[PDB]
Amino acid sequence: MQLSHRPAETGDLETVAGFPQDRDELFYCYPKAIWPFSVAQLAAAIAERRGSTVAVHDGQVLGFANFYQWQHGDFCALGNMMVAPAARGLGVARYLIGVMENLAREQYKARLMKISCFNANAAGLLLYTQLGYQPRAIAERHDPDGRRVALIQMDKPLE
Ligand SMILES: Cc1cc(=O)oc2cc(OP(=O)(O)O)ccc12
């Protein structure tokens, strides 16, 4: 894996919008989105968020992430973390999370990164734990079927 990163571009939209493979995956990375996902929904998120970034390997966009909260001198909150289906488990999310941690430190002077993860997303909970994130709180949310889910709110000091 030879990964690089750059800001997301218009031309990447269609690729990235192809990443969520089912309603659960879309919900875990973008819970306000409606299935089926679309470029317009992704672009609307990008326009109201900050730091939309892609990860690239062998000429392919393999990952995407941004911030949905940012508070200068304080923290950022990571969201829209998506990985191409052929590139799962290969370190793309770990890579991009490290890039986003640097961006939060450098641009926003953040002392903390927040990641919230829905309870069903075991792979996410385990990854964030490996990367040094700690659970802090659990909040109730509702999924598109009106069923109660638990949002596990995690954080990590930055340096
Ligand atoms: C997990 C997740 C990803 C994302 O991109 O946005 C989120 C936005 C969220 O907003 P509320 O706290 O429900 O207002 C919750 C979770 C996420």
What does the CA dihedral 22, 60, 80, 9 come to, rounded to 10 degrees?
Answer: -130
Resolution expressed in Å: 1.3
For ligand 1, whether the C-beta of 29 sits within 6 Å is: yes
Token pair belonging to 64: 């995407």
Give the number of C-alpha atoms closer than 13 A to the C-alpha of residue 49, restricted to the C-beta side: 23
Question: What distances in angstroms separate CA 124 from CA 13, 31, 83, 92, one per listed residue?
Answer: 23, 15, 12, 12
What's the CATH number where 14 sits? 3.40.630.30
d(CA 57, CA 155): 28
Q: Is 76 annotated as a binding residue?
A: no
User: Domain containing 141: what range?
Assistant: 1-159
Report helix angle 92-108 to 122-130, nearest 10. Answer: 60
Ligand 1 center to 111 CA (angstroms)? 20
Kind plus residue range of the DSSP H or E element containing 146 = none
Bond from prior residue into 31 cis (ω within 30 degrees of 0): no
Domain count along the chain: 1
Q: Write the DSSP symbol of residue 37.
A: P
Contact 107, 50 (CB under 8 A): no
Q: In whole angstroms, give the CA distance from residue 27 to residue 143.
A: 8
Is residue 80 lining ligand 1, measured as CB closer than 6 Å? Answer: yes
